[PDB]
Motif scaffolding. Structure first.
Motif: not given
Length: 285
Positions: A85-87, A224-236, A257-262, A267-271
């Motif tokens: 689950e997402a917290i 994971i996806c949301l996290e990988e965008l913290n890299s300056p370039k697209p990660s493998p 699900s909206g579970v990431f909007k907080g 999150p909007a930019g990343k999604i």
């Protein structure tokens, strides 16, 4: 003359790093007789302290990585009860490098009322600690906890002084001194564990084999996806995920699900970004 002393004060002008600051403040209190003085907390700048503390947390994380402590999932995998689950915008992912968990858990965020939290890891980290009292992680936690505590003791002292409550300032000065001594002790104990020194797919996760990746739910795949965008370039890693169709329905459903909007990392930019990359990669596999 000197008989009538001015109030003791702790300044920041002589220091720019968190360890130095605490060191100067500890030398002053250790070298003062805690009976003869009146305190003045006004010069203490909590925002600057936090800025220093956060840089301190970051640097510690960097060193732990370089010196390869934490020496297959992470130390916390075995203590997860979330059920994926997402917290607070994150689901537990057993492949998070513990230096990343370190940064999230102990970084003081003004957004979250100056609290340091990583909801999805608070449980598993507590269980781990209880089961490895002498581990390197517990020494890291003891350290950063004392740091956090120092900051809050100073806030308590500052508020008490503003409200004109004297006893609440002098008992906390003793506590503050004890905390300084504890912090420096923890700091010395860590210098030993760092001892001597000496990931392709991601900066934030250990390698994930195809079996383990397929086991992930949408919430996990999405964090994971949301996290990988913290890299300056697209990660493998993120390319591996977004390239494979079997993952998309899970991920996109988690987004919906909206579970990431907080989240506070856009999150909007990343999604939007992630959805765009998905379109790009699903033109021709």
């Amino acid at each position: 003359s000197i008989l009538e002393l001015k109030p003791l004060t702790l300044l920041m002008t002589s220091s720019t790093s968190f360890s130095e600051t605490i060191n100067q403040w500890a030398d002053i209190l250790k070298t003062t007789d805690m009976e003869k003085f009146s305190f003045d907390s006004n010069p203490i700048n909590l925002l600057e302290l936090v800025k220093q503390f956060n840089l301190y947390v970051d640097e510690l994380a960097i060193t732990c990585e370089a010196n390869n402590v934490w020496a297959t999932p992470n130390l916390f995998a075995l203590y997860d009860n979330s059920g994926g689950e997402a917290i607070h915008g994150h689901a537990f992912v057993p492949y998070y490098k513990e230096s990343i968990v370190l940064r999230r858990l102990f970084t003081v965020d003004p957004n979250t009322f100056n609290l340091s939290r990583f909801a999805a890891f608070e449980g598993p980290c507590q269980l781990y600690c209880a089961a490895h009292a002498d581990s390197a992680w517990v020494k890291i936690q003891t350290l950063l906890t004392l740091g956090n505590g120092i900051i809050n003791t100073l806030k308590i002292i500052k508020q008490a002084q503003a409200f004109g409550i004297d006893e609440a300032v002098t008992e906390n000065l003793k506590a503050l001194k004890e905390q300084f001594i504890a912090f420096q002790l923890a700091e010395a104990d860590i210098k030993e564990s760092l001892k001597a020194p000496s990931n392709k797919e991601s900066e934030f996760f250990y390698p994930i084999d195809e079996k383990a990746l397929a086991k992930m739910n949408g919430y996990q795949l999405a964090t994971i996806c949301l996290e990988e965008l913290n890299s300056p370039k697209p990660s493998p890693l993120i390319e591996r995920i977004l390239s494979n169709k079997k993952f998309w329905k899970r991920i996109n459903s988690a987004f919906e699900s909206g579970v990431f909007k907080g989240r506070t990392d856009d999150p909007a930019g990343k999604i939007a970004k992630i959805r765009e990359w998905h379109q790009l990669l699903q033109i021709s596999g």
